Every structure is written in C-alpha cells, then in structure tokens.
C-alpha cells in the first residue's frame, strides 16, 4: 500500500542485469581493495577495517547524527567494524561487542587498531534473550534482508523491541538499524520510541539500492513518515532511470596501538 512496499514488489521483478545495475546506481562505496589484501594475509599490525559496515558509522559519526562516548555496546557486532571504529575515539572508555557467531554467522576478528586493548568480544550470544547491561552509547546493526516483506517486518520489529529493552537512562547516544522502515507497523513502533527517546531516522548513502534500510539515531530530530517516504521516492526514481555508476570513497583507515583510559 505504501510507496516502499511498491518499491519492494518492483525490485523482486528485476532480472539479474537489471538488479546488478540498479543496486549500485548513484550510491556511495568504499574502496575495500587494501583491506581485503591484508585480511587474506592475516596481518594484525595494519590499520584496516575488518568490514565494509564501518563506513556507515563513520558517516553517521562525522556528520553529527550520533556521538560516540563512554561505555559502548555493540549488539550484533559481526566481524567488529563498528567496535574497532568506536575504540579509536578519544571520548570512548570501553567497548563490548556481542554477536551470534554460529553456523553461517560471522565471528569477531582480532585486530590491533587504536584502542584494541579496551575492546572485548563475545560470540555464542543472542542479544534478543541475553541479560542487558548499561551503556552510554548503544549500537545495533542487526537486520538480515529477505525477498519476503513479512519476514523483513518481523525481523525489524524484533530489533526495535530489543533496543527498547537494552536502552538505559545513561544511554544518551544510540544507533539502530531499521531494515524495513516502509511497513506501517514499523513506522508506528518508531513513532512510539521517538516519543520516549527523541532522535530521528536517516538514510546512509553507503546502503545499496536493493535494501530500504535506514538508521534510528540520537543526534537529529525529524518526521519518521516523511523521511521514510523521501527515501522510497528516491529509490523509485533511481529504478526508473538507473545510472549503473557508484561514487567511490576512501576506506575507513585507523591508527594502531593501545590507549590509556
């Protein structure tokens, strides 16, 4: 019924070539060539990011959509690109990363970029059921894509319900993935969270056109419904006239070393 749902139905109708051409049209991409090189070698003394995902939190951080500070929780940390980025920030005290790391799911990668000494990881951890702990900064990049919209809305809702469970009164800063923001249920859940916590929803330009994902962040205020539809219209406009060409940016590179306090 919504414009986003129309986008989803049209995406599921594209052929391979149409799909591949559409998914990169006018998006932004990091050059991952250097990092792939060193990750294959197995080098831990070079200042690369363990994931493509780090580019998203850098963008949000540098643009002022969120502050990164104090005790940091990274829920669904995967390889740990959000965790290592956080640990290199001078206002950051400690970083704790939780992820599944089971069959098919990625595990934490050990790296020695700046502040590695104040990062701790735990796999075999389900953030939906495990006990919560306090934080000043709460991060969550969870939300697996699906061609089924009802699967996407269920995964999204579950992420948002768990975020509310995790958020502490000290948690002034937050960044939560919203996989399928086009669903009316998801809009209603976001509006209700916003009433309590403030903040707003944003589209990160590093997301491919083949996902409608957006991020619920703490450092901006906006109209949820208007922001979701502005992205839907944008994703629809690109589908009609796909450029096939992405913007390339330099990757997330960090210093190495330990940090004091």
| Mode of pairing for the β-strands spanning 247-249 and 92-98 | unpaired
Coil, strand, or helix at residue 201? strand
Closest distance of CB 201 from ligand SAH, Å: 17
Nearer to ligand SAH, 73 or 235 (CB): 73
The beta-carbon contacts of 157-164 under 8 Å, at least 24 apart in sequence, are 157/185, 157/186, 157/189, 158/128, 160/186, 160/189, 160/190, 160/193, 160/216, 161/189, 162/75, 162/127, 162/128, 163/138, 163/193, 163/216, 164/193
Q: How far apart are CA 226 and CA 211, in angstroms?
A: 18
The position carrying tokens 């000290």 is 170
Candidates 85, 107, 83; CA nearest to 95 is: 83
Number of residues counted as binding ligand SAH (CB under 6 A): 21
Query: What are 69's two structure tokens?
Result: 């500070």
Nearer to ligand SAH, 71 or 177 (CB): 177
Closest distance of CB 59 from ligand SAH, Å: 12
Nearer to ligand SAH, 66 or 242 (CB): 66
The single residue among 5, 106, 154, 249 that binds ligand SAH, judged by CB under 6 A, is: 106
Candidates 68, 75, 112, 76; CA nearest to 94 is: 68
Helix locations, the chain, DSSP H: 3-11, 16-23, 33-41, 54-62, 81-87, 149-166, 184-197, 224-240
Check residue 105 for interaction with ligand SAH (CB under 6 A): yes
Query: What are 128's two structure tokens?
Result: 């939906």
Query: What are 101's two structure tokens?
Result: 């790391």
Closest distance of CB 84 from ligand SAH, Å: 8
Nearer to ligand SAH, 144 or 191 (CB): 144
Check residue 161 for interaction with ligand SAH (CB under 6 A): no
Nearer to ligand SAH, 141 or 172 (CB): 141
Candidates 63, 104, 70; CA nearest to 87 is: 70
Nearer to ligand SAH, 127 or 186 (CB): 127
Closest distance of CB 16 from ligand SAH, Å: 25
Closest distance of CB 39 from ligand SAH, Å: 12
Check residue 97 for interaction with ligand SAH (CB under 6 A): no
The single residue among 127, 157, 201, 224 that binds ligand SAH, judged by CB under 6 A, is: 127
The mark string for 48-87 relative to ligand SAH (x by CB under 6 A, - otherwise) is ---x-xx---------------------xxxxxxx-----
Nearer to ligand SAH, 111 or 235 (CB): 111
List of residues contacting ligand SAH (CB under 6 A):
51, 53-54, 76-82, 98-100, 105-106, 125-128, 141-142
């Amino acid at each position: 019924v919504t414009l986003g749902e129309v986008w989803k139905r049209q995406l599921n109708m594209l052929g391979k070539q149409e799909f591949e051409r559409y998914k990169v049209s006018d998006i932004t991409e990091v050059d991952r060539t250097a990092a792939r090189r060193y990750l294959k070698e197995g080098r831990t003394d070079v200042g690369i990011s363990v994931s493509r995902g780090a580019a998203k939190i850098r963008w949000l951080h540098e643009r002022g959509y969120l502050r990164i500070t104090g005790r940091v929780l990274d829920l669904g940390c995967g390889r740990g690109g959000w965790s290592y980025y956080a640990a290199a920030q001078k206002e950051v005290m400690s970083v704790k990363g939780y992820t599944l790391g089971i069959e098919g799911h990625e595990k934490p990668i050990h790296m020695q970029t700046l502040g590695w000494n104040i990062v701790k990881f735990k796999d075999k951890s389900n953030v939906f059921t495990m006990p919560t702990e306090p934080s000043d900064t709460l991060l969550c990049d969870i939300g697996e894509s699906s061609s089924n919209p009802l699967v996407e809305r269920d995964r999204t809702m579950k992420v948002l319900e768990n975020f509310e469970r995790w958020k502490h009164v000290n948690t002034e800063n937050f960044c939560v993935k919203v996989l399928a923001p086009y669903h009316p249920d998801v809009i209603e859940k976001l509006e209700r969270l916003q009433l309590r916590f403030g903040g707003g929803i944003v589209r990160v330009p590093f997301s491919r056109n083949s996902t409608h994902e957006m991020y619920y962040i703490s450092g901006a205020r906006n109209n949820i419904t208007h922001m979701v539809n502005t992205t839907s219209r944008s994703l629809l406009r690109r589908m009609t006239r796909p450029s096939g060409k992405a913007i390339i940016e330099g990757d997330v590179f960090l210093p190495t070393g330990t940090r004091s306090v």
